[PDB]
């Protein structure tokens, strides 16, 4: 387009289709991520009023103007087109000085990068003319860090760059270090010229010096860790998966320059660890690997004085990186081969290094051996994970699962989610149980709780679920006790773990955010680090002793020094309250934002709305801390959030629904959490009922709906205190205590005594009362006799009289049908598929054992049963009878699998001895489970 009237029509359809193929929501996107090069060539010689706005899918010239004004004004003021800027402004509708102060970052960055590549009138003199020699200095004082970011964005690398640094001028350590890095590894290739403006590369040492001289900083030393992390994250952010794989290689050149120019601040402290973690994803990339491997080897070899003070990060990163290099090795061609060789050399170097590693701050001597085992195994593993004894994958898996449960643990969560995703993607389950690594009951009771925490992700295959199931089942029987993860109702333990040390919501939010700087995707970590930098900066500024104390104890020391922007001031680059809103899956996120916006003076709530809206599942984890922070803030002021929340609770708690159950759990956990936070100016814990105004009878009913019986009982006791029995019956039938049910008073009759006898699981005593009812309802042609028959079958199944219950079933439950079938050995029932009953699962395994001629159809049916039962346990809402029954099923399938796999007489006798050993626990265990 640059006839023009008509040719620029076919270009409206192409750029329309280029979007419809690269999955970018419209062509205006393609104008946004290609703004500089488009404007730089057009505005170079023409106005901005004649721009072909109709392309890219705009509607009027002013919309493109409003979208691209910053880059537009930047280019114009680089080109001395003042009256152009004037017309641009007076076309937007505002004044030139405002439009020059809003877009001041790019403008100074460009007008400095350019006019030292030319060297008459400048582009800064116009800044001192439109703004005055004082507002200009104040602005250049506000936007320093942003200006350094923009200096690192618009600059080239297709050139000898180590000449300017090593040139006999200010700083040559930059070139020395750059040359060393490019010796430890280098892509000898070249790339296309970068998107303009792209000034030359022998100007960074001069642009920075000029700028510092204009604002009295130490141009010889400006790099604090805040600035290093800021700029490196800006760079890593600027990439885009659409712009092709040479873009990443280019940005890696720029990052190596930032490193070798940043001196020592970027090979120790938080920049070191963060940069390594970021260069993890780049390493496992076929197109851009050699540069990442060189930079990584440099950072590890040089920053080794620090990696000896930090064995936790080193262990986590070592495991993650050796796992990532293992899959890469397993998975034109000549170019690929060279990359594989270099990568294998790097892997060997890493193995030698880790084998020669000693840290003074290795706390216990056992941890040291755990580190040594993790490394010496991960260095030799294969691309898949198995469970057979003696092999490397199994030793590593067992070491991860063993470290998982401890007080001083090595790896962090994202460092387990990368090793447990390689060793469990294609898992290999041993045939027998004598080759397994968790083979004995003695070890399965110990390692039986972490295996359940392991199988709660979705990157785990089938064979791994079947193995985890075998072990859980084996442990249940020998231990006698269900895993402690399953039988937890409230989330208060997790909330208390977050705020470790003091019970404040600021420590909770700080730990939650600090948990994102390690578990992000180069965009989440960016928001987390920006939030931390603003929070710590404002704490060091306003000297909040409270907030400072919260920061010292939540953030480690490296992430604390780095977060404070002491040298450079922070640059400018960083209805729900009504019913029926409880049912959309974003209630918590909208309500949390709505609450956090109402308290701007709290810095910890001011930086949340971005993270609450972008990150997924963050609002549910941070909801109690946000509610408490707001309520505690406006305690003496006008209490608005209290009034709104306590008026809506009257409608939210009386909400029976399936889609609203998961937000109702979060409301109950927020009420429980507020009960543990001391209100200021209280005499007793009885005043913690004034955070909100909850009707405790409604909360007790709601907690009963969600399956929260101990929480429901606590709320029912608080309600009774407020007074001084239809919900107490539902609580007491289901709560897990043998004797509590009998404390409840209800009106007497033969029916109620029958109800108590059927709760009690009595034998002949309930058979008498049920027989009487059943006869009296068959005689009177009553319709309840059906239910009576059901009750009778249940009773007769709890006695052991299988023949009588069989005859009662054939006169027309699921558990009763298949329990009776299994006891009488009737192996021809058609068993339903995908059923949540344990009797069906156990029945199918024994049936298949009847109708089969080879052991490896029976083993497949057993393993399918373990896998299904394990999935069922993970499904969530189960009482403590169904839960215990399901775990018992697992124990029966495990014993079945144990006797199927005996080979000689000695194994038979060892099985028998195991039965005798198990008996010792059974003598005192619960009766249903025995």
Q: How far apart are CA 227 and CA 728, in angstroms?
A: 60
Helix (H) or strand (E) holding 428: strand 427-428
The sign of the torsion formed by the CA atoms of 359, 361, 365, 366 equals negative
Distance, in Å, from the CA atom of 581 to the CA atom of 591, rounded to the nearest integer, reads: 10
d(CA 320, CA 410): 13
- Write the CB contacts of 587 (distance below 8 Å, at least 6 apart in sequence): 576, 581, 663
Both tokens of residue 369?
A: 């051996």
**Phi/psi-derived region of residue 671, left when phi > 0, alpha when psi is between -120 and 50, beta in every other case:** alpha
CB contact at 8 A, 889 and 842: yes
Q: Residue 315: which residues within 8 A CB-CB, separation 6 or more? A: 371, 374, 375, 410, 411, 415
Cis bond before residue 861 (omega within 30° of 0): no
Method: cryo-EM
- In the chain, what is the straight-line distance between the N-terminal and C-terminal CA atoms, in Å? 83
384 and 425 Cβ atoms separated by less than 8 Å: yes
Listed residue (393, 402, 255, 266) closest to 322, CA to CA: 393
Count CB neighbours of 502 within 10 A. 12
Asked whether 232 and 258 are in contact (CB, 8 A), the reply is yes
Q: What residues are paired with 385 via a beta bridge? A: 427
DSSP 13-47: HHHHHHHHHHT-SSHHHHHHTTHHHHHHHHTTTS-
Contact 108, 140 (CB under 8 A): yes
C-alpha 182: how far from its chain's center? 36
- Using CA atoms, how far apart are residues 901 and 909, in angstroms rounded to an integer? 13
Helical (H) or strand (E) element with 386: strand 385-386
DSSP-assigned beta bridge partners for residue 388: 436
According to DSSP, the residues that pair with 436 across neighbouring strands are: 388
- Beta-carbon count within 10 A of 779 CB: 9
Q: Of 271, 276, 274, 310, give the one whose Cα is nearest residue 295.
A: 276
Tell me, letter by letter, the H, E, C secondary structure of 321-338: HHHHHHHHHHCCHHHHHH
Q: What angle do CA 360, 361, 367 make, to 5 degrees?
A: 105
d(CA 835, CA 192): 60
Instruction: Tell me, letter by letter, the H, E, C secondary structure of 508-535.
Output: HHHHHHHCCCCCCCCCHHHHHHHHHHHH
For tokens 């419809």, what's the residue?
20
Q: How distant, in Å, are the alpha carbons of 88, 107, 237 from that of 70?
A: 11, 8, 19
Q: Yes or no: say if 892 and 842 are a contact pair by the CB < 8 Å rule.
A: yes
Asked if residues 764 and 799 have their Cβ atoms less than 8 Å apart, the reply is yes
838 token code pair: 């344990």
- Quickly list DSSP for 658-695: STTHHHHHHHHHHHHHHTTSPPSS-SSGGGGGGSS---
CA 637 to chain centre: 36
The token duo for 891 is 């124990």
Q: In the chain, what's the furthest Cα-to-Cα distance?
A: 114
260 contacts 181 by C-beta, under 8 angstroms: yes
Q: Give 286's Cβ-side CA count (13 Å radius).
A: 11
Using the structure block, give the residue that is written with the tokens 């964005």: 153
Going by C-beta distance under 8 Å and a sequence separation of 6 or more, which residues neighbour residue 501? Answer: 507, 553
Rg of the chain in Å (alpha carbons): 34
Contact 255, 237 (CB under 8 A): no
509 by Cβ neighbours in 10 Å (0-12 / 13-18 / 19+) ranks as: buried
**CB-CB neighbours of 717 under 10 Å:** 12
Using CA atoms, how far residue 877 sits from 423, 726, 727, in Å, is 29, 22, 19
Residue 867 DSSP SS3: helix
* Secondary structure E strands in 108-223: none
- CA–CA distances in Å: residue 389 to residues 349, 392, 397: 28, 9, 11
* Cα angle, residue 469 at apex, residues 823 and 873 outer, rounded to 5°: 80
CA 827 to chain centroid: 47
Phi, psi torsion values for 386, nearest 5 degrees:
-125, 180
**Rounded distance, CA 524 to CA 612, Å?**
11
């Amino acid at each position: 387009p640059g006839c023009v009237t008509h040719s620029a029509l076919y270009a409206a359809s192409c750029i329309k289709r280029i979007a419809q193929t690269l999955k970018l929501s419209g062509p205006q996107e393609l104008f946004k991520l290609f703004a500089p090069q488009l404007l730089y060539t057009w505005l170079d010689n023409d106005s901005i009023q004649d721009i072909a706005y109709e392309i890219f899918g705009f509607s009027s010239l002013l919309d493109l103007l409003r979208e691209a004004q910053t880059e537009a004004a930047a280019i114009m003021m680089m080109r001395g087109q003042e009256q152009e800027v004037c017309q641009l402004a007076q076309s937007l509708g505002l004044t030139p000085e405002k439009l020059v102060q809003q877009s001041f970052t790019k403008i100074i960055a460009y007008s400095i990068a350019h006019d030292i590549s030319i060297a008459y009138v400048t582009g800064e003199s116009r800044m001192r003319k439109i703004l005055g020699k004082e507002e200009y200095l104040a602005n250049i004082h506000l936007n320093f860090a942003d200006i350094i970011s923009t200096f690192f964005d618009i600059f080239d690398q297709e050139d000898p760059i180590e000449k300017a640094f090593r040139r006999d001028e200010r700083f040559a350590y930059a070139a020395e270090t750059l040359e060393e890095i490019k010796k430890l590894g280098h892509l000898p290739t070249a790339l296309p010229p970068n998107q303009q403006p792209m000034f030359r590369a022998k100007y960074l040492p001069r642009e920075i010096v000029h700028l510092c001289s204009r604002t009295q900083y130490e141009p010889e030393n400006i790099w604090t860790p805040a600035l290093v992390v800021f700029v490196a994250r800006k760079l890593l952010k600027t990439i885009h998966p659409a712009l092709g794989p040479l873009h990443a290689c280019s940005v890696l050149r720029k990052i190596r320059v930032l490193i070798c120019l940043a001196g020592d601040h970027a090979i120790s402290g938080y920049p070191l660890e963060m940069l390594l973690h970021s260069l993890r994803v780049f390493v496992v990339d076929p197109e851009c690997a050699d540069d990442a491997l060189g930079i990584t080897q440099y950072l590890i070899k040089r920053g080794d004085e620090y990696l000896k003070r930090t064995p936790s990060f080193l262990a986590g990163y070592a495991l993650s990186s050796l796992a990532d290099l293992r899959v890469f090795l397993s998975s034109q061609e000549s170019q690929f081969k060279a990359t594989k060789s270099k990568a294998q050399e790097f892997h060997a170097w890493f193995s030698k290094y880790l084998a020669a590693y000693d840290s003074p701050e290795f706390k216990d001597e056992g941890q040291k051996q755990a580190f040594r085992s993790i490394t010496e195994n991960a260095a030799h593993i294969r691309a898949s994970g198995n469970a057979e004894k003696g092999t490397h994958e199994s030793n590593l898996l067992l070491e991860i699962l063993k470290d998982w449960g401890r007080e001083n643990q090595l790896l962090n969560e994202p460092a387990r989610d990368v090793a447990l995703s390689m060793l469990c993607g294609v898992f290999n389950i041993p045939p027998s149980s004598r080759l397994d690594v968790i083979e004995t009951d003695e070890d399965a009771i110990k390692n039986g709780a972490v295996v359940w925490k392991s199988c709660s992700s979705q990157r785990l295959g089938g064979e791994y679920l079947a193995w985890a199931g075998r072990v859980l089942g084996r442990s249940f029987a020998a231990s006698g006790e269900v895993p402690e993860d399953l039988l937890r109702e409230s989330q208060l333990q997790e909330y208390r773990r977050l705020s470790q040390g003091v019970g404040s919501s600021e420590e909770g939010l700080l730990n939650l955010i600090k948990s994102l700087t390690i578990s992000g995707d180069c965009f989440t970590a960016g928001l987390a680090e920006a939030a931390l930098r603003t929070i710590v900066s404002d704490a060091i500024s306003d000297n909040d002793h409270d907030l400072l104390s919260a920061c010292q104890e939540s953030l480690p020391e490296p992430l604390l020094i780095a977060s404070n922007w002491d040298p450079y001031r922070t640059p400018l680059s960083d209805e729900v309250f009504s019913a029926r809103a409880l049912e959309n899956p974003n209630w918590s996120q909208h309500l949390a934002i709505r609450l956090a916006l109402s308290a701007p003076k709290i810095v910890t709530l001011r930086v949340l709305p971005p993270i609450l809206s972008k990150v997924k599942g963050f609002a549910e984890r941070a909801f109690p801390f946000v509610v408490h922070l707001v309520l505690a803030y406006q305690l003496d002021k006008q209490q608005s959030a209290k009034r709104e929340l306590s008026e809506s609770l009257q409608e939210w708690l009386n909400f029976t629904s399936e889609p609203a159950k998961e937000n109702l759990k979060l409301l109950i956990n927020t009420i429980l959490y507020l009960r543990t936070q001391p209100l200021p100016g209280e005499s007793s814990i009885a005043d913690r009922a004034h955070w909100l105004d909850v009707n405790m009878a409604s909360a007790a009913a709601a907690a009963t709906r969600c399956g929260m019986y101990k929480v429901a009982l606590l709320f029912a006791e608080l309600a009774a205190e407020s007074t001084r029995s239809d919900i107490l019956l539902e609580i007491f039938e289901n709560i897990d205590d043998p004797d509590a049910y009998y404390g409840l008073s209800q009106d007497a009759s033969l029916s109620t005594v029958l109800a108590r006898l059927e709760y009690e699981n009595d034998g002949a005593k309930s058979l008498a009362f049920r027989g009487a009812q059943y006869d009296s309802h068959l005689r009177g042609r009553d319709l309840q006799s059906r239910q009576d028959c059901n009750a009778l079958i249940k009773a007769l199944s709890s006695l052991g009289l299988a023949g009588l219950s069989n005859s009662l079933l054939q006169s027309q439950s699921l558990d009763a049908t298949f329990t009776t079938a299994r006891k009488l050995e009737i192996w021809n029932l058609p068993a339903p598929v995908n059923s949540d009953s344990w009797a069906v699962t156990v029945y199918k395994a024994y049936q298949s054992m009847y109708q089969a001629q080879e052991l490896d159809t029976v083993r497949s049916m057993v393993h399918d049963g373990l896998k299904n039962t394990v999935r069922h346990l993970s499904s969530g809402s189960l009482n403590t009878s169904v839960l215990r029954q399901q775990l018992g099923a697992l124990a029966a399938l495990t014993e079945l699998d144990d006797i199927l796999n005996v080979r000689d007489q000695s194994e038979l006798q060892c099985t028998l001895a195991t039965f005798e050993k198990r008996s010792k626990w059974m003598m005192s265990g619960r009766y249903a489970d025995v």
